[PDB]
Structure 1
Amino acid sequence: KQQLLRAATGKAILNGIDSINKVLEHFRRKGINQHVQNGYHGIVMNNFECEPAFYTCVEVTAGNRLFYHIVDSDEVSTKILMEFNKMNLPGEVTFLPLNKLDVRDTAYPETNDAIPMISKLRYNPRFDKAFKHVFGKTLICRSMEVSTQLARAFTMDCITLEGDQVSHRGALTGGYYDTRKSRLELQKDVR
């Protein structure tokens, strides 16, 4: 079932997800902090869709940011975390707080050689600042050589469809990437 998605995720990553649900359940047993649950909107990967031509570069771009937690506020964020650590729970958790996110527009150069990754994702406009934060800085580029030039000249990360990365500051990432089913594809099946 949906446990196929869990098997692809990695227990270190699942730890934070389970622990966050431990905190929420605990708040529910004490009848406190209903605003925390009401302001918890789940992880990035559970709140967008894209065509399968983009699975590899989207998933490589996000990395563990697919498991960032979209929440209403810094209030929701810190209350969960304070309890998370009080209970000495395992995992790491990152929050995208809608009331505090501050995202910067940058100059996409209009070219067939590179297109914005953000406009290839389908998501609820209420989470725009969350998706702009994760994806608004990356272009999908036609080749490593184009990636090299555009990431050098502009303030955008470049990634090829095959997953090679050039950061706008010079960081280079690459290696062998499987033909296994993407985490994104497995999520597509449970949605």
Structure 2
Amino acid sequence: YRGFSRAVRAVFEEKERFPGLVDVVSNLIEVDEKYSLAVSVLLGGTAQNIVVRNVDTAKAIVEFLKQNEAGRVTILPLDLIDGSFNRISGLENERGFVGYAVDLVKFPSDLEVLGGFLFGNSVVVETLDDAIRMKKKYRLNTRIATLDGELISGRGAITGGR
């Protein structure tokens, strides 16, 4: 169920009320179908984040949602988000290395900061084995996704059990 939450729906229903509103992340991303599964898992729920021009628009949306109890949303003000990231020396030499997710996705020129913010130094590789191997060789805490849509990360704490 990937439909927009009712909070997001509510915001755009009265988009006029917010001039600095740009769009939801999913509608701004441009990527080749080949990388769609990997990019999608890297994005996760941030696909529904609301991109706005400035903090005032963000504030206006929050106040709006608050007084209408229409739910919660996550907003990315272009003037506030940090899109900085550092590539990891040597990863490009790894077997199965496809590329940094930021290099596999395009946004309209004036929104380049989004790539950096959304993907940081996340990496895309051909297969899970490549992912596991890379994470070990470089003790990466960075997120790594496969062309199949699988994802691994620095992992916060020990999880599992099933």
Normalising TM by the smaller chain, what interval? 0.7 to 0.9
Structure 1: segments with no counterpart, 5+ residues: 1-7, 28-35, 174-191
SS class of match (1:163): coil
Shift of 1:113: 2.7
Report the Cα offset of residue 9 of structure 1.
2.3
**1:69 equivalent in structure 2:** 50
* Aligned amino acid, residue 143 of structure 1: T
Q: What is the match of residue 156 of structure 1?
A: 142
Partner in structure 2 of residue 96 of structure 1: 76
**In structure 2, how many angstroms separate the alpha carbons of the residues matched to 1:24 and 1:107?**
37
- CA–CA separation in structure 2 for the residues paired with 1:45 and 1:172: 31
How far apart, in 1, do the equivalents of 2:14 and 2:64 lie?
Answer: 7
Partner of 1:126: 110
Give the TM-score normalised by the residue count of structure 2. 0.81
1:9 partner amino acid: R
- Is the 1:72–1:99 Cα contact (8 Å) retained in structure 2? yes
2:134–2:140 contact (8 Å) kept in structure 1: yes
Deviations 1:132-184 (A, max 9, x none): 111223101122222123334234211111111111346899xxxxxxxxxxx
Map 1:13-162 → 2, pairs under 5 A: 13-25=4-16, 27=17, 36-37=18-19, 39-90=20-71, 92-108=72-88, 109-111=91-93, 112-114=95-97, 115-152=99-136, 153-162=139-148
Measured in 2, the distance between the counterparts of 1:60 and 1:66 equals 10
Partner of 1:188: none
- How many residue pairs get matched? 153
From the superposition, tell whether residues 40 and 171 of structure 1 become closer, same or farther in structure 2 (CA, over 3 Å).
farther
* Inter-CA distance 76–151: structure 2 relative to 1 (3 Å threshold): farther
Query: Percent same amino acid at aligned positions?
Result: 18
Secondary structure of the residue that 1:110 maps to in structure 2?
helix
TM-score when normalising by structure 1:
0.70
> Does the CA contact (< 8 Å) of 1:98 and 1:129 recur in 2?
yes
- Structure 2 unaligned runs (5+)? none
CA distance in 1, matches of 2:122, 2:64: 34
Are the structure 2 counterparts of residues 127 and 171 from structure 1 closer, same or farther at C-alpha, using a change threshold of 3 Å? farther
